[PDB]
């Protein structure tokens, strides 16, 4: 009946003076916009249909046309920024917010979805949706004693839309909006649906991606233990944002990092640092690098959890981007660590894989490794065991690499190399 209409026919129906003809044409547009391949979004926009769709959102008397026009506009808004803008420019934002209070669940859900796409476009539209007052009615839909009574698809859509209100920076979302949303986010983070958990973690990862004050707003809510639990989930779509959030948190103060350690996070890293998904190993190693940039007692916990051999492992064999994070973890470790801690690193076999990476065609990692070697020598001086270290470096082919780096096409590289040779070799 409404399958594969031309845009011309859709226009004719929508321009008819007949609400039922309008409904059928709107449904025809929804089906076009919902097809698997290449929905004709620009053709619909060019036909001038958005303002009509927007006016149909207000037809309380005809719930089906509210639904079809909400779905059509959702799909237009799912496109490029320019396509999303066309929807906003038609006055869709307050019209969708009004539909949040609809007695028809499928309609309120579609309005949730549409606002998710609008907010998802970026900071400006996110903040505009917030200024039109979306947060109160969105949160009201979740004000039930038990989230399990809500339809699953419905809850997933709400969680996703709330995550887009938390998303993006320059600027970050308004502080008052974040405070308003957080208690519901905390509740969603404890829900048992894998998709809700994933999107809740994404939201938290967005909120902790910023300065220490933003991190603190989240940590103060007491979510770190739950994040660490999710860090151990079997589902990769949960582990990914949980790990990102944890990694963000440890970029904060030492006290914020300590909450992550206190919550048991380090016990998960044997698995994360050997995870078959390269992006998990990379993010886990980056996270370690920010833990080893912490206090000596925090470095000590890394030691106690047996994580130094795992860092040696990643340095020895991993995707290059991961090996680079490992190099950072080592340099941070060697900068902040005690002599005994630094010695331990050598006993775990750090020297040979460090030296092997000096043959890398990346100027930054070389500088990073050179700094580590310097820091390790410094601890060796305090023990009068410089020569023993020099031999280790010589035996594994390290001296050949450092000596060659004196003739390197970079000032900082050459200087650090020549200094090492003309002081220990």
């Amino acid at each position: 009946g409404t399958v594969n209409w031309s845009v011309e026919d859709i226009v004719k129906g929508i321009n008819s003076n007949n609400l039922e003809s309008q409904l059928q044409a709107t449904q025809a547009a929804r089906k076009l916009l919902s097809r698997e391949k290449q929905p004709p979004i620009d053709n619909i926009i060019r036909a001038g249909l958005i303002p009509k769709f927007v006016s149909f959102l207000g037809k309380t008397d005809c719930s089906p046309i509210q639904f079809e026009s909400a779905w059509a506009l959702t799909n237009i808004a799912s496109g490029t920024s320019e396509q999303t803008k066309a929807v906003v420019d038609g006055g869709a934002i307050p019209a969708f917010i009004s539909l949040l209070a609809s007695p028809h669940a499928h309609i309120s859900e579609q309005a949730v979805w549409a606002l998710g796409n609008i907010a998802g476009d970026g900071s400006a539209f996110r903040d505009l949706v917030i200024k039109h007052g979306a947060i109160d009615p969105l949160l009201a839909l979740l004000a039930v004693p038990d989230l399990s009574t809500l339809a699953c698809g419905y809850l997933r859509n709400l969680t996703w839309t709330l995550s887009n209100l938390c998303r993006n920076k320059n600027p970050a979302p308004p502080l008052d909006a974040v405070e308003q949303i957080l208690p519901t986010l905390v509740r969603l983070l404890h829900h048992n649906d894998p998709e809700v958990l994933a999107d809740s973690c994404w939201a938290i990862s967005y909120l902790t991606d910023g300065p220490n004050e933003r991190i603190e707003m989240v940590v103060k809510k007491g979510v770190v233990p739950q994040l660490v639990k999710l860090l151990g989930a079997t589902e990769l779509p949960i582990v990914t944002p949980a790990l990102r959030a944890i990694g963000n948190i440890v970029t904060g103060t030492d006290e914020q990092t300590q909450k992550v350690i206190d919550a048991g996070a380090l016990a998960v890293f044997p698995s994360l640092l050997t995870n078959p998904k390269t992006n998990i190993q990379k993010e886990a190693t980056w996270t370690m690098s920010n833990i080893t940039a912490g206090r000596q007692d925090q470095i000590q916990q890394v030691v106690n959890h047996g994580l130094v051999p795992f860092l040696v492992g990643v340095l020895s064999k991993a995707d290059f981007k991961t090996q680079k994070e490992a190099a950072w973890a080592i340099t941070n470790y060697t900068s902040g660590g005690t002599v005994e801690q630094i010695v331990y690193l050598v006993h775990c076999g750090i020297i040979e894989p460090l030296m092997n990476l000096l043959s890398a065609k990346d100027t930054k990692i070389i500088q990073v490794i050179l700094d580590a070697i310097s820091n390790i020598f410094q601890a060796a001086e305090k023990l009068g065991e410089t020569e023993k270290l020099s031999i280790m470096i010589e035996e594994c082919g390290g001296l050949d690499k450092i000596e060659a780096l004196q003739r390197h096409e970079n000032e900082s590289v050459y200087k650090a190399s020549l200094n090492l040779i003309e002081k220990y070799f």
Partner: peptide, 5 residues
């Protein structure tokens, strides 16, 4: 020496 994103 923390490094953000």
């Amino acid at each position: 020496p923390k490094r953000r994103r």
